Amino acid sequence: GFLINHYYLEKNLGYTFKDRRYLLQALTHPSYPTNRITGSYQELEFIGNAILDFLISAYIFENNTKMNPGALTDLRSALVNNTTLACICVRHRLHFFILAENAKLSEIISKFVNFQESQGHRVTNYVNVDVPKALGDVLEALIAAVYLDCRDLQRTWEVIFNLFEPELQEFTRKVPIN
Amino acid sequence: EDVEIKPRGYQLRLVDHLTKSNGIVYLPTGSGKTFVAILVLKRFSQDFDKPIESGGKRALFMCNTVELARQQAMAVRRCTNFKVGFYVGEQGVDDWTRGMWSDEIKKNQVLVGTAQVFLDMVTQTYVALSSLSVVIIDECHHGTGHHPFREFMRLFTIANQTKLPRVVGLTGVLIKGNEITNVATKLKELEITYRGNIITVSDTKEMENVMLYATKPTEVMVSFPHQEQVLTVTRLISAEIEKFYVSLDLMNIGVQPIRRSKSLQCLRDPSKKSFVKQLFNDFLYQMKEYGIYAASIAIISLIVEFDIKRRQAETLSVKLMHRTALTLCEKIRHLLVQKLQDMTYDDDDDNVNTEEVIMNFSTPKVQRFLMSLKVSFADKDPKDICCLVFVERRYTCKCIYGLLLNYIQSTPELRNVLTPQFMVGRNNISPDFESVLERKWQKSAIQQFRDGNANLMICSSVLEEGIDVQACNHVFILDPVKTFNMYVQSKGRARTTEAKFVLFTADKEREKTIQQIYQYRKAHNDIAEYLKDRVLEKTEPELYEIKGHFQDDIDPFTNENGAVLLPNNALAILHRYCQTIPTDAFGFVIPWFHVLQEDERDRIFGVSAKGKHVISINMPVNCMLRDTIYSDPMDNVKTAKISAAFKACKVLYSLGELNERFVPKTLKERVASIADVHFEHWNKYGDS
Amino acid sequence: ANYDKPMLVTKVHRELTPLSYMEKNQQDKTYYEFTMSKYGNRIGDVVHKDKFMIEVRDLTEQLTFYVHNRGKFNAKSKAKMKVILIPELCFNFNFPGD
Amino acid sequence: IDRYEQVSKDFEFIKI
Amino acid sequence: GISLPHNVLALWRENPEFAKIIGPHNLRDLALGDEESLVKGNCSDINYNRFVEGCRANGQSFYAGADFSSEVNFCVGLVTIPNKVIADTLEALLGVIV
RNA sequence: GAGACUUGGGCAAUGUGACUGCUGAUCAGC
RNA sequence: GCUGAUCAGCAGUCACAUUGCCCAAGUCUCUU
C-alpha cells in the first residue's frame, strides 16, 4: 500500500527485492507520520554510509594505483560527498518515492531537482541552491537495504557501481579539488 | 530627619508573626509589601554562610514573571548585604549539570527566579526542601489550579515534614477571578494551598501608618453616548474581507500540521491561516469600536505585520499568501484614506483640520476620551503629569498610540505636554509604522516611562501586575473593567496623593458597571471584615485538609533517588524529550494525541470504561516507544490527556530515556554509560 | 469650539448682525446658519438674533520674546482669517484686553 | 449617515 | 512672590544627605489645595509625612542612586555652570574694563 | 516554532432547583 | 357549568452544577 510504482523504483535502482520492508524503511523520512510498522531511514543510512564508503575506497585502492595518496583521498572524499549522492539520487529518479510530509523539505527537493534538470543531471561545480541532505541519506539507506536483503557485498557492489559509473569514470580523470 | 528607612510597628509585628508561624501577608501594593519581605528574608539568614554539606541553608524568592523576578533580585541585592542570583529560562538553565547547580547555590545565599525554574530545580533533586530556610512567594494569589505555585506547594506533601521551610506569601489582592461571592470559602482554600493563615493590619495606628505609602484614588465615571449605526465604507471593507476569506480558504499553501480544538473534538484551520484571519477580524473590531481614523492606523499596523511575516516566510506559497493579504490591506488603506480626504473642503489650515477630521471620524468613545485628555492636561508641565491608559486588546494599544501621536501633533495646547508610549504582553507587536528592517531606537517603553521621557502610557493589562512603575496621577480605564483583581490593582497604580481614577462607560451599560463596581467594593469589605473578625489559635491548617486539597489529581511518582515526576509536568517532559530525538531541521514531529471512540474503547477496556474518557498516544517513528500508550479511564479529556502523558513518561523512564531525574538523556550521559565498557584502557594513561 | 483658548475682541460691529452674508468666500453663507451647521447641536439656538456682533483676534501662546521670530509669515494671508463672532455664544471675562 | 454624531463639551466627572 | 512650601524648603536645604533623593516624581505628591497654598504657606502633616516617606523609599526602588538635580535644581535656586563659562565670563569682564 | 498555565466574554448541549401555558387523572366545594 | 386540591404529561421561562466550541488578555518553559 505504501509502495507505489514499486516496479519503476526497482528497475531504476537495479535491484529486485525479496523482502520489501527494508525498502519501506529505506524510503521513510522521519517526518512521515503514517508508517507505524517500520522505523525511519536513519538506522539504515547509518550502515549504508559506511558500506558505500568502504566499497568506494576498495575500488579506488585496487584500480587507481597511479595517483598518489593525496589524490586518492581527494577522490574518495569527492565520491562519498553528500552533493554527489544527491545528484545521483536525482539522476536515477529515486526522489519520487521519498515518504515525507514536510513542506520546506519538499520545496527544497523540488527546487534542487529543477536545478539539476537544467544541468542534465551532470555534477556541476560541487552542486547557489540548497542541497537537501535527505536525498543523500535516502540513497545511503537504499544501499544498506539492498545489502541487508541479499547479504552479499558483491551484489551490493554491482548495484553501487551501476549507479556511480559516470561519476567514477569522470572523477578518475579529474580530481575535484577545492 | 534621616535617609535610611526604619521598619514600622506593623512591619515588625508581621515579621514576628511570620518567624514563628508561616502565613500570607495581605497588604496594599507599595513599598510596605516588599520591605516586609526583605525583613523576613533577613530574619532567616542564620545559616546562609555555612555550606549545605555542613548543615547550611538558603533562601528562595520565587516570583510569577521574569521581569518581576529581575526587579525583586535587584531590590534584594541593593537593599541587603547578601548576594543574590537570578534564575530564569533565558539563562539556558535547562542544560545545567549537577555541578553547575551545586557551585551555583554554593556562591549565592538568596536565589530569585520564576516558579518553573525552581520547580524543575527541586523536582530534579538539585536541592532538597531541607536545604532552604525560607521560601517567599510574591503575588501568591496566582497559585490556583495547576499554576506552578500550587505545583511547588504540592512538593511539601511528599518531602520530610520536619525539615519544611517557611512559606511567606505576598499579595495585594487575594482573589483572582470574579468568584467574589462567598469570600470565606475562597480565602480558606488559598490558606490551605499554602500552609498558613492570612495576616493583615488591623490597628488604626497600623492602618494610618500603612496609608503613608498606599493611597485611595478618587474614582469617577465619564459617560458617553453609544450608537450602533455604521458607515458605508465599513460595509465595503467588510464585504472585501468576506471575499478574501472565501478565497483564502482555497489558498493551497503546502501541507500543514493538523490543528484541533482544546479538547480535540473539532478540527481547525492551519495556524498560518489562523494568524491572518485573527489579524483581519481584530481590524474589523477596531474599525467598529473606534472609528475610521483608528482603522486608518490599524491598517498600517497590519501592513507592517504582514510585511514582517512575508519576509520571515520560508515557502513560496506562504510568501504568495502574505502578498495577497498585503494587497488587500493596501486596498483597505486606500479606501479609508479616500474617505478621510473626502472632507477637506472645510478649510485650508491643516493643523486644525487634523483635529477636525479626528473628532468627526471617531466614535463618541474616542471623542470623549480625547476631550477628557484635553481638559485634563490643557497647559500643564510635562513633568507634572504621569498617566496610564488601560485598554483590552493588543492592537488597540498601537492603534490608540498612533491616534494620540497624530492628535498631540495637532493641538496647540497638548503639543508640548503629552508624550505617548505603549507596551503589550508576550508576542510583542512591532512598534513601528514603517516596517523598516532595523531601527536605531533602543530604549524600551517602560524604561522611557520610568525615566520621565514619556508620561502617557497606553498599556493592556501588562502594567496591572508585577512591573514596578512610579506613582501615576491619572489612570484612564478606557475599556470596561472585567475582573475584581484588575479593578483593585489598577486602582492601586494611582498611588499618588489626590490621584484621579477615571472609568469610561457607555450610556446603555452604566447600570451594569455601577453594580459591578459596587459588588467589587462589597467584596473588598467582606475580605477586610472576615480577616478582622476571625480568630484562630492554631493559625495554620491541619494535615488532613492539606492532604485532602491535593488528593484529587493523579498521585505523583518518585524513584529511589528522590526525583519526582509530577503528572502536570508529564506533557512538558514528553514534548521536551520529543524535541531532542530528531537529528535534522525537518525531523521534528510531536506525539499524535488521539481520543478513542466508543466502539474502540469498549473493545480495549471493556465495560470498565463506560461513561469515561480515554486517550491514546502515538509516538513519532524515531522514538523507541511504538506501543500506543493508553491513558487510564478518566472523567474528562484533560485528565485523560494528562494520564496518557504520565504513562508515556513513566515508560520512557523505565526504558532509560530519562536519566533518573526525569529529563531526557543527553549525549554525554549516553557515552558516559559506555566509557567503562569500550574505553577502559584509557584510564592507565590518565585520560577519559 | 474645540479651541478653548482665550482671545481678545478688538471692536464691536453695531451695524453688523446675525444672518449677514460672509464677506469673503462665503457670501451664500450667513453667520447664523453656519453656527447652527457647525455647533448647532451644541448650542441649540441663538438668542437676541438682531443685536450686534464682535470681531476678535488671537493672542500668541509664547512666553519668551528675546529671539527674533524670523519666518515667511505671509502677513496678508495671516490677516485674511478675520473672525466674526456672536456675543452671547462666547464667555466674557471682565478683564481688560490691553 | 456618513458622520459620527458629535458629542457636547459639557460632560463632567460623575463620582462613582 | 511664589515659592515652594516653607517646611519642605527647610527640610530640603537643611539636610544635605536628604537633598539628593528628592525628585520630580516625589514632587508630584505635593498637590496642595487652595488653603494650604494661599494662607497656611506649607503642606499639612499628612501631606508632609507622605512626601517624606516617598522620598525615603527612593533609596530602595529603581530610583536609587539617580540624579534628579537636572530637573529639581530650580526649586532650590541651585544651577550647574560649566567651567568654561566661568572662565569666559571672567575674561569678558576684563574685556569690558579694557 | 512548539507545549503548558491562570482569567474573562459569547454560544450550544446535558443535569438539577422554581414557575408558567395546556391536557388528563384523583379529590372537595358550587 | 363553575372553583379549589392532588397527580401525570408537555411546552416556555429563571437559576445552578457539568460539558463543548469560539474569541479576548496575561503568564511560563522547551528549541533554533
Residue numbers in the entry:
A (entry chain E): 1428 to 1554, 1605 to 1655
B (entry chain E): 2 to 689
C (entry chain A): 887 to 984
D (entry chain F): 344 to 359
E (entry chain A): 1281 to 1378
Sentences from the paper on this structure:
In Drosophila, an RNase III enzyme Dicer-2 (Dcr-2), aided by its cofactor Loquacious-PD (Loqs-PD), has an important role in generating 21 bp siRNA duplexes from long double-stranded RNAs (dsRNAs). ATP hydrolysis by the helicase domain of Dcr-2 is critical to the successful processing of a long dsRNA into consecutive siRNA duplexes. Here six cryo-electron microscopy (cryo-EM) structures of Drosophila Dcr-2–Loqs-PD in apo and in complex with dsRNA substrate in the absence or in the presence of ATP were captured, illuminating the continuous conformational changes of Dcr-2–Loqs-PD after binding to dsRNA and translocating until forming the active dicing state and cleaving the dsRNA substrate into an siRNA duplex in the post-dicing state. Loqs-PD is a cofactor protein that comprises two dsRBDs that are responsible for recruiting siRNA precursor substrates for Dcr-2.
In the absence of ATP, we found that Dcr-2–Loqs-PD tends to dimerize and forms an initial binding complex with dsRNA. The dimerization interface involves the RIIIDai domain of one Dcr-2 and the Hel2 domain of the other Dcr-2, and mutation of residues in the dimerization interface results in dissociation of dimer. The dimerization interface also disrupts the ATP-binding site of the helicase domain that otherwise is well maintained to bind to ADP/ATP in the translocation and dicing states. The high-resolution (3.1 Å) cryo-EM structure of the initial binding complex is good enough for us to unambiguously identify the density of the C-terminal tail (amino acids 344–359) of Loqs-PD interacting with thehelicase domain of Dcr-2. The short C-terminal tail extends and wraps over the surface of the Hel2i, Hel2 and Pincer domains, mainly through hydrophobic interactions and hydrogen bonds. After binding to a dsRNA substrate, the helicase domain together with the DUF283 domain transform from a stretched conformation to a closed one, wrapping around the RNA helix. Notably, the DUF283 domain rotates about 150° around Hel1 and directly contacts the dsRNA. Residues in this loop extensively interact with the backbone phosphates of the major groove that is widened subsequently, resulting in the dsRNA duplex bending around 10° towards the DUF283 domain. Moreover, the phosphate group of the 5′ strand terminus of the dsRNA is specifically recognized by Hel2i through a salt-bridge interaction between 5′-phosphate and Lys310 of Hel2i. Furthermore, the DUF283 domain recognizes the minor and major groove of the dsRNA terminal duplex through Gln580 from region 1 and Asn635/Lys642 from region 3 of the dsRBD fold, respectively.
